[PDB]
Amino acid sequence: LELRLKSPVGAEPAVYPWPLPVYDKHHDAAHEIIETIRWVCEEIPDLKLAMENYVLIDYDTKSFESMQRLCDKYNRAIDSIHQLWKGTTQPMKLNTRPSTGLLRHILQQVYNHSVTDPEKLNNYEPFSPEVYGETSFDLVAQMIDEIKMTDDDLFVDLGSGVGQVVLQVAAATNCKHHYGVEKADIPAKYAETMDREFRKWMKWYGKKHAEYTLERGDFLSEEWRERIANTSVIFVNNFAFGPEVDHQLKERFANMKEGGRIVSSKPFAPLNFRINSRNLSDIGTIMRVVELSPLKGSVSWTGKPVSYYLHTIDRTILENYFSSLKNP
């Protein structure tokens, strides 16, 4: 006993067992199904035209027959569209990036099928750098919009967790390669499934994504000193990392190339930094730090609007300080 959803591009259908499973208090397979049909209809206008006809809310997420009528109606619409693409009509353009709305849905879908037990992500040692927290989809979307990236860039999420930041960025930009490194076994284990599900679902919807690799590791290791030095865009949610880990990271960012950028939850250098005789070795001497705009309606436990910072390796700061020493 199941429910099947055909791929708009011919991949293997999506199969859901019945009763439909629940993911958490706010997500169940039944609504994922309804939402997937809704989004494929966004990708294919003709499909949307065939779906309107006769689907007057007459569906109960709790009735097998009712949900089966929804899936079959969608699947028959998919067959007609596929016939339509055999005639003169042009097929849905392939290998294109997903829209922001579709991406939100695809990542939620991948998460649903990968993080089977969300609770285990909380089995970390409190008050340690191991503290787990997820950056909202929207913040990453904002970062992507403000930090124009190109195929010349390399993106790294230090302490990537189950890897959803790397997947969103890989689906939205054309970096040469995206990387995510996570130390804890639990999030790293889920990242493996996250990776499989993402590739599977992106193929299912017929969407393209840049190259990316989710790996297990310690970003403070020797291998990572040079890896970090060659990254042009680094994302790091260091809110709970601590002064010791942040200090090490600074040593490593100090080797990055001109124009390199870092986005984080806690700034690595004060926003009011002013070079002088006492802080010549301070990280703030080689980087501009700006606070990204707070996303409207987005607060954290601190009651204030969630804050992220953008650092840009700019050694022109230090060079101007020395010139000022020479004149006068």
Ligand X SMILES: CNc1ncnc2c1ncn2[C@@H]1O[C@H](CSCC[C@H](N)C(=O)O)[C@@H](O)[C@H]1O
User: Which range, of 32-40, 102-110, 178-186, 312-320, touches ligand X by CB under 6 A?
Assistant: 178-186
**Which has the closest alpha carbon to 285: 263, 327, 316, 251?**
316
Neighbours of 243 (CB within 10 A): 8
Contact present, 214 and 166 (Cβ < 8 Å): yes
Which residues ranging from 60 to 119 are in contact with ligand X (CB under 6 A)? Answer: none
The answer to whether 300 is annotated as binding is: no
For the record, the structure tokens of 103 come out as 């991406």
C-beta closer to ligand X: residue 187 or 260: 187
Q: Is 168 in the site for ligand X (CB under 6 A)?
A: no
Contact present, 269 and 311 (Cβ < 8 Å): yes
Give how many residues touch ligand X by CB under 6 A: 21
The answer to whether 219 is annotated as binding is: yes
**Which has the closest alpha carbon to 312: 297, 282, 291, 328?**
291
Provide, rounded to whole angstroms, the least separation between the CB of residue 241 and ligand X. Answer: 6
User: Which range, of 19-27, 45-53, 183-191, 256-264, touches ligand X by CB under 6 A?
Assistant: 183-191
Question: Contact letters (x/-) for ligand X, 241-260, by CB under 6 A?
Answer: ----x---------------
- Select the residue interacting with ligand X from 147, 181, 191, 283 (CB under 6 A): 181
For the record, the structure tokens of 317 come out as 């700061």
- Select the residue interacting with ligand X from 109, 168, 231, 237 (CB under 6 A): 237
Q: Is 183 in the site for ligand X (CB under 6 A)?
A: yes
DSSP-based three-state secondary structure for 262: strand
Beta strands per DSSP E along the chain: 2-5, 14-17, 22-24, 27-28, 154-158, 177-182, 212-216, 233-236, 261-264, 287-291, 309-313
Contacts with ligand X, residue ranges (CB under 6 A): 129-130, 132-135, 157, 159-161, 165, 181-184, 187, 218-220, 237, 245
Query: From the annotation, which residues make up the binding site for S-adenosyl-L-methionine?
Result: 132-135, 155-164, 182, 218-219
